[PDB]
Design a protein around this ligand. Structure first.
Ligand code: FES
Ligand SMILES: [Mg+2]
Lengths: 220, 96, 99, 86, 111, 135
């Protein structure tokens, strides 16, 4: 058990990019997906200024260099969690992409909550689901805002319950409590599809690498 | 250093600042024809700027000119002079 | 020699376009609900136009059409609001179909 | 804790507290790292770091909370409103 | 629980054989209608509410449908929509929506 | 018994402090990954404020030198009849072709703005571009 854990769990933590997530994307791919388009300058959020490249005719432009760095970190974290077999829950209240996100979750073997987030799903989880339920080990927000342009209550609840949160934060979002913010465009279908594909690929790579490493260790 | 970085300038696409129809033109208490274009045909009331579409300065000029003409005998007070009822309408009022 | 974000932004068609007012763009109907056509035209948002009474059947998912943009995003501030209310969709006029 | 019954109130409060634990840094495990002057609403708390063996010279409630935290030596003056919750 | 229901089913089979023996009928061809008739005869109750009367039914009919535990030993739930709290309902909605999308892409008897 | 004080520190700091204190017996699954590859900013809650006095947002409008040429082109000739195709990353509008021709003419060593404008218009006409003036 000791050696197994030491060589399985802690081995990947010794490498900058163990799962090679940087190859999954490039600044050009994000640009082509339009990850760099934000809302009007009037909708801008005070905490999203550091990630905004500028304002092109009252339209904010998200610094895709910072997006690339943040996306690297978020994808690496997600890959490591999937490798460690944690529960990854995808949250998004964008009804335009509810179906897509649910399908991505089902395909990648993780969970999704794209519906009306009932109060207490995380803070009252033991009562709602059962005393032995296992809460998600990572929450990935494809849209950190609810359908009234307020932060998803899941963000606050995840911070409360100490569940790390990856999250795509647009120029009108509040990245303060999101553990791994990925400044980007969460409203374009192209951008949302790119995010879904990236997270799906990273999680699948992590799971398959976990299986491969386990087989390598157990066969010897 | 880098040429693709944005440069600090003004907005070359800025649309012109809309000018009131009287901008640059001299409102005179003797130009009763012009003054009557901003008084109700039926009651003689001076239209507000939400009807005339005039800047504040030109609205004040028009009002002062109308009052001065009315008290100096150039303009009727209670109605628009019938001679000017058929002048180019420039007021956003539709009674019918 | 790898294009940077600055270069990409400078040379992007959207940046090359000035204000999106009265600009003729090519949209693509990606979703239709009754007579409402949701058209994506390369912006951050889509425009929901109305199936023209003439040649209405010709407007189907995937159809490429001509729009005259009026605003990439429909936002505005209202009395007492701290941040702009946005309807999360562009404003455009459907001029017909591109062939 | 709010309850129609005192014991239920006690249970609610003490069970909710453990889910809202702070962690307090103690200098040498007996006092605070530096003097702290703060105002929460209308209550001013002026806490002074003190040497070993000085004791807790604090409002009785602060003495209780410091014994819980693990602070042995500190001075504390409470000015303004003495509202217990604030 | 499942083991409890299994024990109840075994009890019901044994009791059904016993009741068939008591009434003299063939244990093999003893049906639920026969069981109900035999119980109504042996334990006559005039209670108006039929549910309050004695009943010897299958445990499946007696006990309510208990939802099985929704996660395994590792703790990971089974259904990807588990955390919605209404996994079955939202799965049905998701399937209906998928069918509607496919239909949109391609193209007095009941209540 | 993870602290539910999302306003006091970050999840990492609270988890670390509770583990140090002994409240948490075992580190949560994500703690090692976080400690190995932390985010660029520690996620500590911050209450947003509204700027009040002379403070202004540091966002700077994205302008380029060619924006002047684009504005002049649109003011002189209007949008045109060739509708933009924003899906193509290499799409070039009539305005962009005019901008390129103006830029190369400037490189040739001409400084007069109106002369550059008229020369570019004539050059595009020669190339076969129907530059229709709005007025
Ligand atoms: S618009 Fe120029 S003075 Fe009124
Ligand atoms: Mg958005």
């Amino acid at each position: 058990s000791t050696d197994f854990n030491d060589k399985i769990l802690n081995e990947p933590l010794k490498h900058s990019d163990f799962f090679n997530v940087k190859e999954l994307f490039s600044v050009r791919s994000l640009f082509d997906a339009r990850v760099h388009l934000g809302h009007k300058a009037g909708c801008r959020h005070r905490f999203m200024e550091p990630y905004i490249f500028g304002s092109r005719l009252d339209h904010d432009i998200i610094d895709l260099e910072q997006t690339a760095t943040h996306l690297q970190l978020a994808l690496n974290f997600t890959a490591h969690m999937a490798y460690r077999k944690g529960i990854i829950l995808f949250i998004s209240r964008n009804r335009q992409f509810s179906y897509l996100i649910e399908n991505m979750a089902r395909d990648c073997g993780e969970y999704a909550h794209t519906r009306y987030f009932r109060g207490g799903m995380l803070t009252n989880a033991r009562l709602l689901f059962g005393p032995t339920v296992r809460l998600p080990d990572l929450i990935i927000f494809l849209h950190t805002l609810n359908n009234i342009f307020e932060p998803h209550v899941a963000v606050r609840d995840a911070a409360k319950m100490n569940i790390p949160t990856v999250g795509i934060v647009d120029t009108n979002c509040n990245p303060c409590l999101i553990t791994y913010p990925v400044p980007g465009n969460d409203d374009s279908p192209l951008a949302v599809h790119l995010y879904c594909r990236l997270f799906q690929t990273a999680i699948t790579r992590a799971k398959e690498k976990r299986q491969q490493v386990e087989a390598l260790y157990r066969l010897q | 250093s880098n040429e693709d970085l944005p440069i600090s300038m003004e907005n070359p696409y800025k649309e012109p600042l809309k000018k009131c129809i009287l901008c640059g033109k001299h409102v005179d208490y003797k130009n009763v024809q012009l003054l009557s274009q901003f008084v109700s045909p039926f009651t003689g009331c001076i239209y507000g700027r939400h009807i005339t579409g005039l800047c504040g300065k030109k609205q004040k000029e028009i009002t002062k000119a109308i009052k001065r003409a009315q008290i100096m005998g150039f303009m009727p007070v209670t109605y628009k002079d019938p001679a000017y009822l058929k002048d180019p309408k420039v007021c956003n009022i539709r009674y019918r | 020699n790898v294009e940077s974000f600055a270069s990409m932004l400078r040379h992007s068609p959207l940046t090359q376009m000035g204000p999106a007012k009265d600009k003729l763009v090519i949209g693509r109907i990606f979703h239709i609900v009754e007579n409402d056509l949701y058209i994506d035209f390369g912006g951050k948002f889509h425009c929901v136009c109305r199936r023209p009474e003439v040649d209405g059947e010709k407007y189907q998912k995937g159809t490429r059409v001509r729009l005259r943009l009026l605003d990439l995003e429909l936002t505005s501030r209202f009395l007492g609001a701290t941040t702009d209310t946005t309807v999360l969709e562009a404003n455009a006029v459907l001029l017909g179909i591109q062939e | 804790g709010k309850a129609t019954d005192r014991m239920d109130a006690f249970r609610k409060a003490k069970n909710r507290a453990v889910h809202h634990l702070h962690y307090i840094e103690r200098y040498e495990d007996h006092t605070i790292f530096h003097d702290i002057s703060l105002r929460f609403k209308r209550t001013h708390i002026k806490m002074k770091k003190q040497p070993k063996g000085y004791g807790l010279r604090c409002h009785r409630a602060i003495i209780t909370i410091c014994r819980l935290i693990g602070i042995k030596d500190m001075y504390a003056k409470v000015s303004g409103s003495i509202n217990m919750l604030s | 629980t499942e083991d409890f229901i299994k024990k109840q089913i075994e009890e019901f089979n044994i009791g059904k054989r016993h009741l068939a023996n008591m009434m003299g009928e063939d244990p093999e061809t003893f049906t639920q209608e026969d069981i109900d008739r035999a119980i109504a005869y042996l334990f006559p109750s005039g209670l108006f509410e039929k549910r309050a009367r004695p009943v010897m039914k299958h445990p499946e009919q007696i006990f309510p449908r208990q939802r099985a535990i929704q996660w395994g030993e590792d703790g990971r739930p089974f259904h990807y929509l588990f955390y919605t709290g209404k996994q079955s309902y939202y799965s049905l909605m998701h399937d209906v929506y998928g069918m509607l999308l496919n239909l949109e892409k391609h193209q007095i008897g009941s209540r | 018994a993870g602290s539910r004080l999302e306003t006091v520190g970050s999840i990492f700091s609270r988890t670390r402090d509770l583990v140090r204190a002994g409240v948490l017996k075992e580190k949560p699954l994500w703690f090692d990954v976080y400690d190995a590859f932390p985010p660029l900013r520690e996620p500590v809650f911050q209450r947003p404020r509204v700027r009040y006095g002379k403070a202004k947002a540091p966002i700077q409008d994205i302008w380029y030198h060619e924006d002047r040429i684009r504005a002049k082109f649109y003011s002189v000739y209007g949008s045109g009849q060739r509708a933009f195709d924003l899906f193509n990353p290499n799409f070039k509008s009539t305005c962009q072709r005019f901008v390129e021709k103006y830029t190369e003419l400037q490189k040739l060593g001409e400084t007069d703005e109106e002369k550059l404008f008229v020369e570019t218009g004539k050059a595009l006409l020669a190339e076969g571009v129907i530059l229709r003036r709005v007025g």
